[PDB]
Amino acid sequence: PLVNDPVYGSQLVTQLVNKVLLKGKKSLAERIVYGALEQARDKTGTDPVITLKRALDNVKPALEVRSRRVGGATYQVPVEVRPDRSTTLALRWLVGYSRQRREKTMIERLANEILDASNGLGASVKRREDTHKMAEANRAFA
Numbered sequence: 001p002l003v004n005d006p007v008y009g010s011q012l013v014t015q016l017v018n019k020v021l022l023k024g025k026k027s028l029a030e031r032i033v034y035g036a037l038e039q040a041r042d043k044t045g046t047d048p049v050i051t052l053k054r055a056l057d058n059v060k061p062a063l064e065v066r067s068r069r070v071g072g073a074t075y076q077v078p079v080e081v082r083p084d085r086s087t088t089l090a091l092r093w094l095v096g097y098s099r100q101r102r103e104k105t106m107i108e109r110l111a112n113e114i115l116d117a118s119n120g121l122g123a124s125v126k127r128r129e130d131t132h133k134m135a136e137a138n139r140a141f142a
Contacts, residue, residue, distance in 0.1 A: 007034065008049045012056065012087070019091045020110070032106050039111035055117035059090035059124045063135035078135040090124070097123040 005013035013033065021029035037048040044051060065076035081089070098106070098113035100123075116122035 008037075010049050010052075012052060012091075013037075013049065015087070015091055016052070016095075019095045020106075032110060035107035036110035036114060039107060040115055043111075043115060051118050052114055055094060055114045055124075056087065056090050058117050058120050059093055059128050060086040061089060061128050061131040062086065064131050065134050065138045076134075076138055078138050090128070093124040093127050097127070 002011055002014045002018070004011055005017070007013070017026075017029050017033050020032050037052065040048040040051045061081050063078055064081050066079050067074055068077045069075075070077075094113055094117060095110065098110040101109040101112060103109045103112055113122060113124060117124045
């Protein structure tokens with residue numbers, strides 16, 4: 001358990017901040033995330049932690065393939081994704097893909113990735129879809 005963030009009382013917000021943080025400066029990651037959330041609020045006029053959960057619903061994977069040794073060879077076998085990992089991945093994707101967006105600032109790119117994901121659009125959502133598709137393709141038997 002990480003802490004409930006002091007503004008919204010959310011552990012999801014705390015983990016987002018941690019995913020945005022590169023090489024030390026907590027203040028800068030906070031500014032990016034609270035900034036992004038306030039932009040979401042401005043756009044929708046609703047609670048941005050609800051927006052963020054809507055994005056996470058669309059981006060969290062339920063199944064994935066994972067490498068496993070079987071009989072001395074390696075196979076990528078479909079497995080359930082545990083809810084902690086599923087959340088981590090979805091945050092990693094939202095952040096990662098936001099970095100290739102066209103908007104001018106990181107605030108605006110993260111906000112707009114979150115907003116698009118909350119509507120079932122963009123690359124984070126496509127990555128979920130593709131993760132599930134691989135899980136389905138790698139079922140050994142029909």
